[PDB]
Each structure stands twice: as C-alpha cells, then as structure tokens.
C-alpha cells in the first residue's frame, strides 16, 4: 500500500507527480480521506478508485511523421529524405523518460553542391591557369558519387586597408606588380564570381578570366572568405537538397579575429551576410575576422562542410585550426594544384564516412542520452557518431529523453540532426505534470466541512492557521489527542528527529540551509553525498537526498560527464577503438595498451598479426572479420595483390603467416602512401 | 644631395648602335629603381625602359624592345642603355632618371642622341 | 593607353589662377605625376600622385583628380612659373605623358 507518495505526495497534487511515476490520486470524493492517499496507481484502484478519477497521467513516444527514407539521391518529386522519424510527440512526466530512435542513411547519388574559393595572391597566378580544365573534369570523376553535381567560384585576397594591403603608399599600389615589370590586381577583401551551377564548363572559362592581386601581410583573409561562403546562401547558390562542399585553396597562413586591431578594425563580426549586388563583401573595411567558434556554428548550423585546399608547408595550422573548426576535413594541395579533383573526390568520400548527431535549442531540464549503432547491432553508450561508414550504409542511434524535476508548461522543439543533413527530426516536447483536479479547482474559503481552506483533487486542503486531518487544530493545542501514524511501524520518535506530529500530518519547524518536504518530513533537500566538498559536486540538485542531475552528467555523485570528447582520440576512434570508455576516461583493454586513449601497447604484436586479418578476409574469405561481416567497413587499407614482394626501400612491414590451407603467405604493409594505408599481398603463398 | 649624370650620346648612322652611361651618387644607388625617359625634337616626353633596383625586372617601350636594353652595376653606381638597329625615331635628348614609385622623382642633365646619315 | 592634355599653350598675367586638365583613356586611380620643364633645363617633380606635392615646391601648385580626369592648378601664377607642364600615367605598361603644356607669362 503505501509506497513513497504515501508521505511525499499527499500534501499536494501537483507533488505527488512530481515525486513519482507510479503514484496516482483520485478525487470526487472516491476515498475522501479514507485511509491510505497517493501510493500507487494499483492500491487506490483496489480501495475503491477504480474510476477515472485517478488522475493518472503517463508519459508516451509517439511518431507525428514518417516519410521514408530514401535510397537514392537523384530520386526526386518527393522530397528525398535522409532519415526516418521526421516529426515526433513526447510526453514525459517528472523525473521519467521516453526512448526514440534515430536512423541516418547516406544516401547513394546524393546531389553535390560545391564552391571553389581561391586564393588570388600572385603566387598562385600559375594555379589559376592549371585550373582552367577544373569544373569540366572535377564534375566528370564527381558523377560516379553523384549524378547532379554543381560548381561555383570565387575568390579572397585580404581586407583592403593599411597594414595588409600594400597601404597604397604611393598610387603604384592602387593597381600593383609595377615593381617587376608586370601588372596585377588591387586588394578586395572577399568576391564572388560565380554562382553554383550545372553548366560546370562555365568554372573552366570563368576562372580563365581571373588573374591575381598583390598582399603585404602574408596572412590570408580566408576566414573572412569562408565565412561568407559559408553564410551568404542566396548568392553562393546552395540548395538545401544537396551536400554542401566549401572548398578553401591556399598557400598561406590566415588572419584570424581580433587581429584586424592593426587596422583599427575592431568591429565584433556577427556572422553574417555582408556581400552585395557587386558580388562583393562590403564589410572588408570595417569588420574584423570571424572566430573559430563562429565558424564552427555557422557552418555547422547550416550544413555546410569546409575542405582545406591547402599546400603542405602550411598544413600544421589548417590541421590545428580544423581540429577547433569540428565537422570540418583538411588535405594537401599540390604546387600546381592539378589534384584538386583529387583531393575533393576523397574530401567529399571522408566527409560522408561519418555520421553525427546534434540537437537544437536543448532546455536546460532535459538530458539526451545516446547509445549509437556503429556495427551490426553493437551499440556504443555517450555518442552522437559513428565512424568508417561508406555511401549507402546506415547509423542507428538509440536517444534516452529525460527530464529533471518539474520545467514550466511550454512546448519546445528539440531539433535532431545529423551534421552536414538537411533533414531532422523535430521532437515537440510537453510536461504532463499537472492534475487536472488542480485546475478544476475553486478553494473558495468555505468548502473544507466548517473551515477556511483550500480544496483540490476531490478533498479538502486545510493550510496553515487552519491544518488538521480536516479543518482543525489550527496552532495545535487541540492537538493532545489522535496519535496518527506519524511514523512507519510506529517506532514512536515524533517524526523523524527534524519535526513534529501534527493532527494527522507532521509539521517541520526547521528552516534552515534549505527546506523539508513530506508528511512524516522525509526529505531533507540539504542531505546528501559530498564529491569535493559539494554535495554531487554542484552538477545536480537533490530531492530527499537523491540527487537529480543536470544536462550532461551521471552517477550518485554527479561526476561522470556523457561526454566522450575527451576520451575520443586523434583518429576519430572512442579509446582509439580498442578499449572502454568511462566517466569520461579509458579503461585499459587485455593487451596492455595505455594512455588516455590506448595510445601505447609496447607489448603488442607487431601490427603484422592484425593486419593479416584484413587481407585473410577481404581477399581471401576467412577469419573473424568474414563472420562478423565487419571487414569491409574495418578495413578501409588498399590491399592489392603482386607477384613479388620488392625491395621498395621505403617504410614496407614485411609480414607474414600460415593459412588453414597449409600455405604461407606474405605481404607487405606500407606506411603514408600519400596519407594512404597500402597492403601488398603476394599472388603466390607457397605451399607443400 | 641626388647627382645624375649621362653621357656616351651623338651621330650615329642608321642601323646603328650607341651606348648610354648614366653616372649616379649622392643615394643608395641599388635601393631604387632607375629610367631612361627621351624628348623627342616635338619637345614630347616618352620613356624607353626601366630597370628595377636590383636590376631582376626590365620593362620597355613597345616601339624600342628587342633593339634596347636597359641594365645597371650596383657596385660601380652606373646604369646603361645599350641601343642598336637605330632609326631616325630614335634621335631625343636621353634622360636617365631615379623613381619614386612609379613617379621620376630626380633627372638628369641630358645626353643627345643624333640618328642621321 | 592614351594622354590628352590641354590646353596646349597659356598666356597668364602675375596674379591671375591657372588649371591644366588631364586625360585619361581608362581609370589609372591615383597613378597620375605632374612636371615642369623650363628652359634648357630637365624636367621636375610637381606633384606626384596625383596630389601628394613633394618638398620645395610651392602650396600654389596643387593637384587634383582621380581615375580618368586630373588637374593642376596654379594660384597666383608668378613670373617663375613660366615653362613646360607635363602629366605623366605610371598604371599601365608603357608609361605615358601628355602632350604638355607650355605655360607663358603676360607682361
């Protein structure tokens, strides 16, 4: 019978949902005053609250839309959708959860807008002429990814003021290279030349007719120019049925925010759209460089991925930068930058190998735990990723929504999206946390028998200066008389230490450090465990000494964060992929690998014992990788087969192992192939 | 104080050739660019070439390339124009002169040039 | 490129204002220098950039002007400032100068 609610929720109906899942009350005088109040749901139900007057409310997931998600790119007339759920309703009650889940596809033949911003200082006069077959050819290799593919074109070359800008010290810099025999173009800042379209052979004539400008400053005004990209939509020609792909091609160094303070420019950038019907950004003069962080959100806020263009004597800072620029993917531009085709086919391939997950617009009272399916049916707990995918598979993320306490009665719509995906899932979420017996309620005074109270829920609420099982008793003093059940088994203290029984209910007199709550003064909100020296470490707040916490954190003590950035290493692999995560560290998996990521395993075999299961499977169909079905997203090498393992001279592992067929087989595992694993496996193993 | 001095000019026979000298001092010889600008008898203005200061980038007058040629010793503070294939075009007090970017800041006193038989 | 300057000659009485006007066949922004010549004498910096004036000459002489169309004036012209003016484009390959004006005094 009576359980938790029985003495937490009774004085109020609104707290007897907020205490617990299972409590239900009913009204209309069903049980007026009967005996037992609020326990569960089934005891009321027996003693005579069958009706529905229970005032029982409970939490649901239900699915508003769900179009189907689509195989394939091109497949337009109906949108072509890149989840599942489209639209979902959430109902939770206080202190309870719903799950949902998340499918992502990356669709196949999936449309492609991409932009080539270039970087017009006059070392690159010789890469603008190389690019002149681009366009033509990047679409043509970009047709085996996609069907419809669309390219544009523009350009930076600094803000065109004092310090960056050769300062217009004489008129010789208004039109510059007067200074070795030859001419060339003024700074502009950031333009625009061509919008995205299908008529890609416009790329090859248009970026014929750019030439060159001159800077002082070597650094490069390419995060101006990439933040307009970025933004400015209605110009750059992005369609929000495609990929975005905002191609970033230098040879230097950029210029960042608060920097522009040499030119006296000290004007905060808001992240916004500045370029004009001149196809020019106006701002170049008067607003400072955008952030790493307002990068990061615009980009990310509209979907749009950058790919670093960039040659290799300055990749340090484009790697470090992208690490802060998260979504993002760098590569090495060549002199003559003839690999850009390249270099994009593989950026576009990299970028559709990850899906992850980010939520909109998040209040402060609900948690959003994720549990994401990486492989088969294996999920990884505190992830809104998943690595080593190819175009055409899928991700499924399971999300736990919960909410703490009791947040205000206000709709808010949680927006769950992939990154880089148009579509979402918007998740419309109330709070049923209000009987309707608390509404439909008039306290009028009079209506409590003979008394002067409130009333709700079917009985009467006598407050203070009136109290009593009833409406009596007010300051005590009639109060030598009825016991009552002021503590389970009658143990007989008053109440509980901290209180005192009053007229059937128990009354705290302590107001100090924070607050009792309860009918035999069970909760105190103060009493609680300690992390260091703070109760659950000030990341969640307490209710009858249980700790409720906040977004982001578990455990009893509220110290485990669900955040796994920390754990995550430099190869996108939570533990490096071989090890646990936990409380936002790694625990050391059997081998003896170490660090904070199972970065070091010294007594390891060497990977030749781990390599040769990625060639025992993907070439010849054996091994744990063929039973798992795992090999073909496991290894993402290149194994190709030779007719003799050569001295290359180079970094070449010379591995080798004994089949199930009693033949020996060797190969070759190559280092940094242009970035690139290479397997080399000999067409003859020898055999008996 | 900036001294420019040419010599080397008189009568050459058409189809010619003649070299100009231009002595200078009293500046950092090699850290500017230097000019030879001609008065044509019309008592027109026209510049025939350029040399940049450390002698890398030589630009000439359309009607003048492949005839002359602009070139200067930094360590013996001279600059000269050697000219060849001469024609009656070609006569004009010659100027050298001494930049201020992209403006001729110092002159000359001027050496003439005769092309006549 | 072409560079048109009038008028060619100009007769001005000590104490009257003079302007000379320069012509430009595109925009050559701010790449305009003025000269003067007088006889038997090398050509002189006035103003360069097309009104930067240089260090010794006089305030009376100011230029003006941007793109394709430039001047130089002359305050209260004096009895020295008689002789040839020149506009000259340092923009484009070839550089190229005016026709010139001849400046003379009225007595």
């Known amino acids: 019978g009576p359980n938790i609610c029985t003495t937490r929720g009774v004085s109020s109906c609104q707290q007897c949902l907020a205490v617990s899942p299972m409590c239900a009350w009913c009204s209309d005088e069903a049980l007026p005053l009967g005996s037992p109040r609020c326990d569960l749901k089934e005891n009321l139900l027996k003693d005579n609250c069958a009706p529905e007057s229970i005032e029982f409310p409970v939490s649901e997931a239900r699915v508003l839309e769900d179009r189907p998600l689509s195989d394939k790119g091109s497949g337009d007339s109906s949108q072509v959708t890149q989840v599942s759920p489209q639209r979902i309703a959430l109902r939770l009650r206080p202190d309870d959860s719903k799950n949902f889940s998340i499918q992502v596809r990356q669709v196949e033949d999936y449309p492609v807008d991409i932009y080539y911003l270039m970087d017009l200082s006059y070392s690159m006069k010789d890469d603008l002429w190389s690019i002149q077959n681009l366009g033509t050819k990047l679409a043509t290799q970009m047709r085996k990814l996609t069907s419809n593919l669309r390219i544009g074109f523009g350009a930076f070359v600094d803000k065109p003021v004092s310090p960056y800008m050769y300062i217009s010290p004489p008129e010789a810099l208004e039109n510059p290279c007067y200074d070795m025999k030859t001419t060339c173009l003024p700074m502009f800042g950031y333009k625009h030349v061509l919008t995205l379209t299908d008529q890609v052979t416009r790329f090859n004539e248009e970026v014929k007719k750019q030439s060159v400008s001159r800077n002082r400053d070597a650094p490069e005004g390419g995060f101006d120019a990439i933040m307009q990209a970025t933004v400015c939509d209605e110009k750059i020609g992005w369609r929000n049925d495609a990929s975005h792909l905002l191609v970033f091609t230098t040879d230097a160094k950029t210029h960042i925010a608060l920097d522009g303070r040499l030119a006296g420019i000290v004007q905060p950038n808001d992240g916004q759209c500045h370029v004009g019907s001149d196809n020019h950004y106006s701002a170049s003069t008067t607003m400072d460089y955008p952030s790493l962080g307002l990068m990061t959100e615009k980009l990310s806020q509209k979907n749009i991925n950058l790919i670093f263009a960039v040659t290799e004597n300055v990749v340090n800072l484009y790697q470090n930068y992208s690490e802060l620029i998260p979504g993002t993917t760098v590569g090495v531009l060549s002199m003559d930058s003839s690999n850009v085709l390249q270099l994009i086919v593989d950026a576009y391939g990299k970028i559709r190998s990850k899906v992850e997950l980010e939520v909109r617009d998040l209040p402060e009272e609900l948690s959003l735990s994720f549990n994401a399916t990486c492989l088969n049916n294996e999920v990884i707990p505190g992830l809104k990723s998943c690595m080593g995918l190819k175009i055409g598979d899928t991700v499924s993320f399971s999300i736990e929504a919960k909410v703490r306490g009791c947040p205000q009665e206000k709709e808010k719509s949680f927006t769950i999206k992939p990154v880089g995906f148009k579509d979402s899932l918007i998740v419309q979420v109330t709070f049923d946390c209000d009987c309707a017996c608390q509404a439909q309620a008039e306290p009028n005074s009079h209506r409590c028998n003979n008394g002067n109270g409130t009333f709700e829920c079917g009985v009467c609420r006598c407050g203070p200066g009136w109290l009593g099982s009833q409406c009596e008793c007010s300051e005590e003093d009639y109060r030598p008389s009825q016991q009552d059940e002021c503590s389970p088994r009658e143990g007989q203290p008053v109440c509980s230490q901290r209180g005192e029984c009053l007229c059937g209910q128990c009354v705290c007199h302590s107001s100090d450090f924070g607050k009792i709550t309860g009918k035999y003064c069970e909760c105190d909100d103060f009493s609680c465990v300690r992390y260091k020296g703070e109760m659950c470490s000030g990341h969640g707040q307490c209710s009858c000494g249980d700790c409720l916490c906040d977004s982001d954190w578990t455990g009893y003590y509220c110290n485990c964060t669900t955040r796994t950035d920390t754990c995550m290493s430099s190869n996108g692999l939570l533990c490096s992929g071989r090890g646990k995560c936990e409380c936002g560290s790694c625990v050391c998996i059997q081998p003896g690998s170490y660090g904070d990521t199972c970065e070091k395993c010294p007594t390891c075999p060497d990977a030749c014992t781990f390599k040769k299961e990625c060639v025992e499977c993907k070439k010849f169909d054996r091994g744990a990788l063929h039973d798992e079905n795992t090999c073909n997203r496991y290894c993402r090498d290149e194994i190709e087969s030779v007719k003799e393992l050569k001295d290359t001279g180079k970094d070449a592992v010379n591995c080798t192992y004994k089949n199930e067929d009693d033949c020996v087989v060797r190969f070759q595992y190559y280092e940094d192939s242009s970035g690139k694993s290479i397997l080399y496996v000999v067409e003859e193993p020898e055999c008996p | 104080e900036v001294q420019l001095e040419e010599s080397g000019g008189g009568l050459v026979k058409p189809g010619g050739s003649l070299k100009l000298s231009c002595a200078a001092s009293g500046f950092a010889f090699s850290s500017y660019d230097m000019s030879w600008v001609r008065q044509i008898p019309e008592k027109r203005l026209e510049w025939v070439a350029k040399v940049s200061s450390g002698g890398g980038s030589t630009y000439y007058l359309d009607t003048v390339q492949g005839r002359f040629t602009i070139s200067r010793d930094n360590a013996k503070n001279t600059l000269y124009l050697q000219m060849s294939s001469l024609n009656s075009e070609d006569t004009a007090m010659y100027y050298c002169?001494?930049?201020?970017?992209?403006?001729?800041?110092?002159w000359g006193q001027g050496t003439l040039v005769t092309v006549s038989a | 490129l072409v560079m048109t300057q009038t008028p060619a000659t100009l007769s001005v009485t000590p104490g009257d204002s003079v302007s000379l006007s320069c012509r430009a066949s595109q925009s050559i922004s701010n790449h305009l220098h003025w000269y003067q010549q007088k006889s038997h004498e090398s050509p002189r910096l006035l103003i360069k950039?097309?009104?930067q004036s240089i260090s010794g000459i006089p305030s009376r002489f100011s230029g003006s002007g941007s793109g394709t169309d430039f001047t130089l004036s002359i305050n209260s012209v004096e009895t020295e400032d008689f002789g040839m003016y020149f506009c000259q484009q340092s923009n484009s390959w070839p550089h190229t100068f005016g026709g010139g004006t001849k400046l003379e005094i009225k007595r």
């Open positions: 002169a001494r930049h201020n970017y992209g403006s001729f800041a110092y």
């Open positions: 950039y097309a009104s």
